[PDB]
Design a protein around this ligand. Structure first.
Ligand code: THP
Ligand code: CA
Length: 129
């Protein structure tokens, strides 16, 4: 896999971000993760965590996996990095998302994320509390 530049337009919630990608606006849904909806426990927390990338980071990059690049809603499907840190991984590590939506073909970072989830679970963090 390879990382490509993009520009943050708006972080929407915990696992959805709108980016300018090759000059066109696209809503990206983060691969392999599920944050609570905003109306559920830890939804607001995950939303603020991801939103914080606007203030807390400088360089945003997208990395597609080897399978489908768009979902049936027209959203991009990718791993998103902020100053080199994977947002997907960070959300799972903090117990703000669960590993989810795992499809063969788009699961390159599955084991990486499951490691993060196991730590967050052991610590009884947030979702796991
Ligand atoms: C992360 C991911 C989500 N999705 C789709 C399936 C879910 O739609 P359905 O329930 O209609 O199948 C939806 C979950 O998105 P949200 O978690 O953003 O609501 O996104 C994919 O199709 N592939 C993916 O890799
Ligand atoms: Ca969600």
């Amino acid at each position: 896999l390879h990382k490509e530049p993009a520009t943050l337009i708006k972080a929407i919630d915990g696992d959805t971000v709108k980016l300018m990608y090759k000059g066109q606006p696209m809503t990206f849904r983060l691969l392999l993760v599920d944050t609570p909806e905003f109306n559920e426990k830890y939804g607001p927390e995950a939303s603020a965590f991801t939103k914080g990338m606007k203030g807390n980071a400088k360089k945003i990059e997208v990395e597609f996996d080897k399978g489908q690049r768009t979902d049936k809603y027209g959203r991009g499907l990718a791993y998103i990095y902020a100053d080199g840190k994977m947002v997907n991984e960070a959300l799972v590590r903090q117990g703000l998302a669960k590993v989810a939506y795992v499809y063969k073909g788009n699961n390159t970072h599955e084991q990486l994320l499951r490691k993060a989830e196991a730590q967050a679970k052991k610590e009884k963090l947030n979702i796991w509390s």
